Amino acid sequence: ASATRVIQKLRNWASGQDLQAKLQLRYQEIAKRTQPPPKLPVGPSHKLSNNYYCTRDGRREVVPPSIIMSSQKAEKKAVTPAPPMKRWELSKDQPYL
Amino acid sequence: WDNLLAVIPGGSSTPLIPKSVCETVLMDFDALVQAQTGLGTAAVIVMDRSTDIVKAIARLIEFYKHESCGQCTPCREGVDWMNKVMARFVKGDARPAEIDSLWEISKQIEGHTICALGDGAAWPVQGLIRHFRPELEDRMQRFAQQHR
Amino acid sequence: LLKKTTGLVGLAVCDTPHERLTILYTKTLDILKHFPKHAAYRKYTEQITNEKLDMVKAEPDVKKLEALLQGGEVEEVILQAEKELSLARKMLKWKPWEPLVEEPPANQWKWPI
């Protein structure tokens, strides 16, 4: 930022870019190292009612896997694991470099 | 009768009923159950418009705190907790979410105890929250205004 | 027109995709006729090959044929048909329509232990 205008023009011509507009070194635009104290918000479970843990106990909703067929327990169309992948559209922003 | 505000019709264990349902209510077990109350010892406590209703209910909960035998955890801890919350409610020192919190505390006490003192202590709080909830909210709002 | 590049490295562009596809599907059906009638692999592979062959015979345009096949590009479809034919030959060698070769021990697939 402390460069002379002749050196700035030489750098700009030699690089082909405006180097002074986007400087690599941070001078004053950064935030202050001393910040005001925060106040973090609370989540949805921070309520005094209608908040029984058994109504939001996601860890106990896990069940053992369902056995489709087993060697001891156990005209239709051929199927696939999923519907086939749709083709990606070419980007309308910048399709080629 | 126009000055009448509330009646506790079966002693302190039964909850309160306001004047509007006091107009045409009978003194049956079944009639008071339909009025969401009970006929207990047939003790008709009458409170007029000059009554501090929250103070009366908190005095009843303080009585239940003093007379709980302390043997079983829901009655012991929950009735003490209800007494503290009701004292703060009388002072106005709470927020309206604590009304729902107190309702859930009373529902946790009711039916989980050894004898029916827990039910008889949770019922007046249930009746007060069911009927005189805008009075509680008015007290909390007045406290919040005059303290900040 | 004719496709310039297929976009995948090492995949050559097919000048005549329809004839190659129909001979590959016909060969796959012919090798599927040697399977037992009760073979679920034979039934399902015959269904897949029949539907794909009907789509090739129905559509003479490469682009809308690709859109109908939904298997990427038509070169990818041709390669998949080659893989299916080689697979069907191997499945005929292997004979997996037979019953289970050996049941596992009783605690082999029990989790948690």
Ligand code: SF4
């Ligand atoms: S519910 Fe009955 S047994 Fe339990 S602490 Fe209260 S008074 Fe005692």
